[PDB]
Design a protein around this ligand. Structure first.
Ligand code: CLA
Ligand code: CLA
Ligand code: CLA
Ligand code: CLA
Ligand code: CLA
Ligand code: LMG
Ligand code: LHG
Ligand code: KC2
Ligand code: II0
Ligand code: II0
Ligand code: II0
Ligand code: LMT
Lengths: 161, 174, 42, 194, 154, 181
């Protein structure tokens, strides 16, 4: 398929991975009696292993010659659920954390003693700020354009060189 | 000040005897919630549609226009609606009543502004409301007959939903 | 509840440990009910 | 100076009997921590969604939109069966309603920036039913109480749909009790997993 | 001090427009009460939205019944899509985009009626009660109150 | 009549065992200073008074209905559709199945929605100053001076007696398994 890879649902090496992974657990299950707590635990592990391989086979992942799933991250939309979409979820959460922390340090600067607000956090105000993060791309872009994100170069301390 | 219709309840503080069909009957205080002019217009719109429906049930039981017995079956009242939707009868009635009610929407907004009495479409081709006494008397007759017609319309259609007979045929049989 | 004990629970190490334990706790719970999420499923 | 709702606790500050449904109930003192304007906005918003949600569960039991994708009497199955494009359309429309109705003052730092902004007043009165000032106190009270009731009722109906895989009205009319063989609560760490 | 979730931007040191609009009490039928431009409510208020909603509802009835209705030799008429109406001068564009393109009821299997819905695809109203009473029922119906009665008598 | 201080009045206890509460004033009709649990202090007196009279009227109607059905007295054709048995429980179940109870329920509920709730709310709010239980229903008179004292007391006492009697009658019928009279 893509990059000479094979879909995991029809690769024989993924199937032998699943079969070997289940044989390892079945030989551990072969030393226990049916209703015992270790046997029940081992059987649930076998069920989880089968579910993982069954889900991966039908997911559109591409396996290598080694039978392990490979991620295609060049931007193609048939594989966007492996990096582009998880990455968009990350950048939303990361920008949330960044916007929320930036808003709290700007609040803490306007305090009576700014450095106590950073070792003893004003938790109601900081929770107001953690609620602010859900619309950070718009809040931060309006902040950027309204001249409130970027400070001018002549307001920043720099070394003599 | 206590209600003429419900003596243990207060006057509904939005209704006055200058209205048509006033009896002091607003126990649930719906007139406070929504504009009385809208409610008056709505009452009269319900009254006139149900009046036409009541006369229609009676007349449909009495006689039937030429040719109609073929298109409908032995269906009557709500029964004819599903079949006359197939032909364009209900489609054309809907189209032209919808066309009138677009202007009825504009008229209702004029009533909300206060530039017109509710239900006053100035429709008097034949002369009946020349005299003022007759005009108020006929506005009271219209509202009372309309409220009765609405109740009657509910009765006739539910009598169809029970027996399938229709008004005149439920009088003749049982 | 005492205001000095609440001001103690607002200190940086307590909030850091509680918030990262809560964070760790919903990563653990999300990987418990919905394990083996190598990809966004689509 | 005691609460009327919880008579053995002190009456909470920011609760002064001005707001509708202000019976003095804040044992955990969230109003002392969180501004009562945000809490009343959030209470009204939760309740209004829940009033529609309770009505949604019962009405979806009675009436359906046509078609096989909308033929799920049990409400939790309608979540999965309803066309995804349209459910995401509902979600996007809700997001648009949130940005316009809040007038881009959506966060806990800029909603109520306008002093004219009132908790719960999004400017929603299409038929001008609040034009009468006299009913305002009763309506605001009855909205708050209907909201609270619907929060409790919808929560019940969902968790009764989970326990008994039955829609709420036909769970009342074909009631089968809890056998306790299944639906045990907890237990992930008692058996040490699995 | 800051109340927490107060929403006043100055309290949280967040930049504020400062220009806080006065709130007009005027309301439109399909819009919200809010700050509006001068003359906006008179031109585009309740009268406008109600009339335009009415006009759209009236205009919907041909739109719902959109189709080429051609009468055969007999009185019976055949409903065909407007796609069948080929256009002469647009080259390879013989079939033309039409009103059904903007309102594709048939493609989605909606079958619209002048009053919305229609014989094909109409509202499904069903009785949850399933023809049995609130109490005093047989095996087929066990109501919640029947469970209370069964609990009391046991 | 009112006869304050002897009955329906201040300083009047039907049972001296239970002390006369200060919270229970003598204004409400048929007030015999019986309030051991002291509800009068925290309850809205107008609501509980109206609720008492409505319970009384329902009970007095209940007693007459149970007596007529237990006696087997019936309206023409009624026995054919409803239960032949004179057991109140059996008739009620049969009446539910016929739809008679549903029709009575519909109209009683309709009255309470459109009239009972407005009257209750306006009495409590202070809109009409309706006396508790007043539904402006004097078709054959008997009101005016008599209504203020003897009739209001007679209705409250007979209704309390009826409430107790109806309670007794249904539990007697349950434990015995057989209807009274
Ligand atoms: C370092 C080099 C490099 C870089 C920076 C990119 C960057 C990108 N590639 Mg490309 N790609 C590369 C190498 C590279 N690719 C190679 C070597 C291959 C193998 C042939 C591909 C094959 C490939 C395919 C097949 C596709 C991409 C697409 C994309 C885009 C991803 C989503 C996006 O922004 O669409 C734009 C979307 C938005 C701006 C908003 C959407 C929400 C992005 C611009 C996708 C694309 O959109 O093509 C333009 C696409 O379909 N890439
Ligand atoms: C459903 C249509 C309908 C509508 C819109 C109205 C509307 C009105 N009626 Mg009419 N009325 C109707 C049916 C209707 N009525 C019928 C069938 C009867 C019984 C014969 C009456 C008997 C009646 C009397 C005797 C009086 C009114 C009056 C009024 C007005 C005051 C507000 C009110 O009563 O509550 C509005 C009522 C409704 C919206 C209908 C009930 C809806 C419930 C809540 C179910 C939903 C208002 C113009 C009073 C008045 O002054 O008129 C000028 C008055 O004295 N009506
Ligand atoms: C929607 C109602 C409806 C329907 C389906 C029909 C249908 C029909 N009419 Mg009738 N007709 C109608 C209303 C209707 N008409 C009305 C309102 C009038 C005015 C009084 C007439 C007056 C009329 C006459 C005068 C005649 C028909 C005739 C016919 C038939 C044509 C052959 C046909 C079956 C003809 C027929 O066959 O009569 C039996 C005929 O001669 N129609
Ligand atoms: C940009 C406009 C737009 C367009 C072009 C579409 C297009 C589509 N929608 Mg979407 N939709 C939109 C906006 C839009 N939608 C918005 C804003 C909402 C949220 C309120 C939805 C919610 C929605 C749902 C829930 C569903 C669709 C479905 C559909 C598809 C089939 C449509 C059909 O058969 O219609 C012909 C059918 C009709 C015209 C029937 C209308 C039914 C009544 C009027 C619904 C009752 C409205 C109700 C009272 C809502 C009130 C709240 C609202 C005022 C906010 C089609 C792809 C359906 C789908 O994907 O099916 C495959 C589906 O399930 N849409
Ligand atoms: C207000 C209560 C009330 C009253 C006044 C009546 C009055 C009457 N009923 Mg009865 N009926 C009632 C309630 C009442 N019904 C109820 C609640 C039910 C439903 C369970 C019935 C079911 C019923 C049936 C099934 C019949 C009557 C009939 C009759 C009429 C026959 C009288 C006759 O010839 O004497 C008869 C005298 C004797 C038998 C005594 C010997 C009479 C007008 C009959 C009828 O329709 O006649 C017109 C009839 O067949 N009734
Ligand atoms: C302008 C609008 C006008 C609208 C007018 C209509 C609305 C007016 C207001 C109506 C408000 C609701 C009224 C009821 C409407 C339906 C009437 C009806 O027939 O209902 C329908 C159902 C009964 O349904 C019956 O079914 C039978 C077959 O099984 C019959 O054949 C009939 O179909 C039908 O009568 O009613 C009920 O289920 C009632 C349940 C009990 C309700 C309370 C009863 C009275 C209070 C005493 C209870 C004490 C209990 C103590 C604790 C006991 C614990 C076990
Ligand atoms: C205002 C909204 C009010 C919400 C009310 C909540 C109603 C439902 C609450 C539980 C109902 C009965 C529970 C019996 C059920 C019960 O006790 O099961 C027991 C379970 C532990 O399992 P065991 O050790 O009991 O195993 C026992 C053996 O008998 C079986 O193996 O306790 C839990 O930890 C489960 C709850 C998750 C704990 C974390 C929850 C998520 C944390 C989120 C942040 C805090 C929120 C509050 C946490 C308490
Ligand atoms: C001929 C072109 C035209 C058509 C075909 C048309 C049809 C409909 C329909 C048909 C189904 C409805 C239901 C409707 C309703 C509203 N229109 Mg109208 N409308 C047209 C023209 C304009 C202009 C130029 C403006 C405007 C407005 C509003 C507002 C909001 C008022 C507010 O909320 O205060 C509402 C509710 C004003 C605006 O604010 O839009 C955001 C505004 O300036 N419209 N409009
Ligand atoms: C914002 C927020 C709140 C909120 C909220 C919430 C949760 C609101 C939820 C709102 C919802 C559920 C809206 C649903 C709209 C459904 C539509 C338009 C259906 C269209 C059917 C179609 C087009 C069709 C079709 C057909 C097809 C395709 C084929 C056929 O075989 C089937 C069929 C014949 C039917 C509130 C308001 C409470 C408060 C506050 O302000 C904050
Ligand atoms: C404001 C505004 C207007 C408007 C509007 C709107 C949309 C008004 C709609 C208001 C609504 C939808 C109110 C619904 C409340 C529902 C409740 C309280 C249910 C509680 C359920 C409970 C307690 C339960 C339960 C249950 C349990 C758990 C066990 C179950 O087995 C069963 C059971 C069900 C019994 C309009 C648009 C007209 C214009 C106007 O100008 C301005
Ligand atoms: C005041 C006071 C206190 C007290 C107290 C006490 C003792 C209070 C007792 C209250 C009681 C006994 C209330 C009983 C109500 C019964 C009614 C209304 C009848 C219902 C039947 C109906 C409607 C019917 C029917 C039927 C008909 C006719 C036909 C049949 O075929 C079928 C059927 C049977 C269904 C205390 C001590 C708490 C303290 C406080 O500080 C002061
Ligand atoms: C007039 C439009 C004005 C704005 C239009 C801009 C639209 C913005 C993006 C539109 C995205 C369309 O969303 C997409 O379309 C429809 C919506 O039900 C869905 O399509 C689904 O339902 C349709 C309708 O029966 C089926 O024929 C189709 O096989 C099925 O996949 C897609 O799963 C969804 O991904």
């Amino acid at each position: 398929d893509v990059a000479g890879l094979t879909p995991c649902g029809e690769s024989k090496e993924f199937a032998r991975r699943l079969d070997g992974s289940v044989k390892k657990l079945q030989t551990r299950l072969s030393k226990y009696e049916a209703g015992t707590p270790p046997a029940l635990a081992l059987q649930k592990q076998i069920d989880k292993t089968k579910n993982r391989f069954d889900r991966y086979g039908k997911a559109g992942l591409l396996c290598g010659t080694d039978g392990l799933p490979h991620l295609i991250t060049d931007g193609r939309w048939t594989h966007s659920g492996e990096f582009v979409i998880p990455g968009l979820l990350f950048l939303y959460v990361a920008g949330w954390i960044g916007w929320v922390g930036r808003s709290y340090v700007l609040f803490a600067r306007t305090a009576d003693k700014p450095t106590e607000k950073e070792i003893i956090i004003d938790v109601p105000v900081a929770l107001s700020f953690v609620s602010t993060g859900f619309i950070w791309p718009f809040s931060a872009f309006k902040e950027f354009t309204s001249g409130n994100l970027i400070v001018p170069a002549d307001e920043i301390t720099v070394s003599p060189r | 000040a206590m209600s003429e219709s419900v003596p243990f309840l207060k006057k509904p503080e939005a209704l006055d005897s200058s209205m048509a069909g006033y009896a002091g009957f607003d126990p649930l205080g719906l007139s406070s919630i929504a504009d009385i002019k809208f409610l008056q217009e709505s009452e009269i719109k319900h009254c006139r549609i149900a009046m036409l429906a009541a006369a229609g049930s009676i007349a449909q039981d009495i006689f039937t226009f030429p040719g109609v017995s073929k298109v409908v079956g032995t269906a009557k009242m709500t029964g004819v609606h599903d079949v006359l939707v197939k032909q364009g009868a209900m489609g054309q009635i809907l189209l032209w009543t919808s066309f009138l009610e677009v202007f009825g929407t504009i008229a209702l907004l004029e009533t909300l502004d206060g530039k017109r009495a509710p239900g006053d479409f100035k429709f008097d081709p034949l002369g009946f409301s020349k005299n003022a006494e007759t005009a108020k008397r006929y506005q009271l007759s219209e509202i009372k007959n309309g409220r009765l017609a609405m109740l009657a319309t509910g009765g006739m259609v539910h009598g169809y939903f029970i027996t399938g007979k229709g008004p005149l045929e439920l009088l003749t049989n049982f | 509840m005492d205001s000095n004990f609440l001001k103690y629970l607002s200190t940086a190490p307590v909030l850091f440990t509680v918030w990262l334990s809560f964070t760790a706790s919903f990563i653990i719970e999300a990987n418990r009910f919905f394990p083996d999420m190598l990809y966004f499923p689509m | 100076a005691k609460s009327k709702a919880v008579p053995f606790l002190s009456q909470p500050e920011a609760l002064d009997g001005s707001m509708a449904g202000d019976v003095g109930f804040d044992p955990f003192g969230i109003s002392s921590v969180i501004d009562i304007k945000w809490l009343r906005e959030s209470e009204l918003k939760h309740g209004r969604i829940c009033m529609l949600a309770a009505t949604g569960c019962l009405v979806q039991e009675v009436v359906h939109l046509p078609g096989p994708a909308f033929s799920q009497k049990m409400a939790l199955n309608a979540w999965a069966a309803a066309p995804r494009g349209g459910m995401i359309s509902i979600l996007v429309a809700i997001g648009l309603i949130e940005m316009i109705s809040n007038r881009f003052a959506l966060t806990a730092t800029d909603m109520f920036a306008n002093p004219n902004r009132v908790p719960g007043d999004l400017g929603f009165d299409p038929l001008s039913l609040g034009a009468n000032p006299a009913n305002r106190a009763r309506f605001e009270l009855s909205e708050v109480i209907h909201g609270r009731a619907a929060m409790m009722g919808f929560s019940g109906m969902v968790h009764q749909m989970i326990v008994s895989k039955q829609a709420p009205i036909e769970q009342l009319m074909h009631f089968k009790a809890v056998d306790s063989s299944l639906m045990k609560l907890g237990g992930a760490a008692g058996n040490l997993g699995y | 001090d800051t109340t927490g979730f107060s929403g006043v931007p100055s309290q949280f040191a967040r930049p504020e427009s400062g220009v806080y609009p006065a709130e007009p009490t005027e309301q439109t039928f399909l819009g919200m009460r809010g700050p509006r431009a001068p003359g906006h409510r008179e031109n585009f208020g309740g009268k406008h939205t109600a009339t335009m909603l009415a006009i759209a509802a009236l205009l919907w009835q041909p739109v719902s019944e959109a189709g080429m209705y051609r009468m055969g030799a007999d009185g019976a008429l055949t409903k065909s899509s407007f796609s069948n109406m080929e256009v002469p001068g647009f080259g390879n564009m013989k079939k033309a985009p039409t009103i059904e393109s903007l309102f594709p009821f048939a493609k989605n299997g909606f079958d619209a009626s002048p009053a919305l819905f229609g014989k094909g695809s109409m509202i499904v109203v069903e009785d949850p009660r399933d023809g049995c009473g609130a109490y005093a029922n047989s095996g087929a119906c066990h109501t919640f109150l029947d469970e209370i009665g069964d609990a009391l008598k046991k | 009549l009112w006869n304050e201080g002897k009955i329906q009045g201040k300083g009047v206890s039907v049972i001296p065992l239970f002390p006369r509460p200060a919270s229970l004033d003598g204004t409400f009709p048929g007030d015999q200073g019986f309030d051991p649990f002291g509800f009068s202090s925290w309850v809205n007196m107008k609501f509980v008074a109206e609720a008492e009279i409505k319970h009384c009227r329902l009970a007095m109607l209940a007693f007459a209905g149970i007596m007529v059905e237990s006696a087997g007295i019936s309206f023409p054709g009624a026995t054919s559709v409803l239960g032949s048995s004179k057991n109140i429980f059996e008739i009620h179940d049969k009446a539910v199945a016929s739809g008679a109870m549903g029709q009575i329920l519909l109209w009683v509920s309709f009255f309470e929605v459109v009239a009972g709730v407005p009257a209750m709310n306006e009495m409590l709010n202070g809109e009409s100053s309706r006396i508790p239980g007043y539904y402006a229903f004097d078709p054959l008179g008997q009101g005016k001076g008599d209504k203020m004292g003897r009739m209001q007391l007679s209705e409250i006492q007979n209704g309390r007696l009826a409430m107790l009697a109806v309670s007794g009658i249904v539990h007697h019928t349950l434990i015995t398994g057989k209807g009274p009279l």
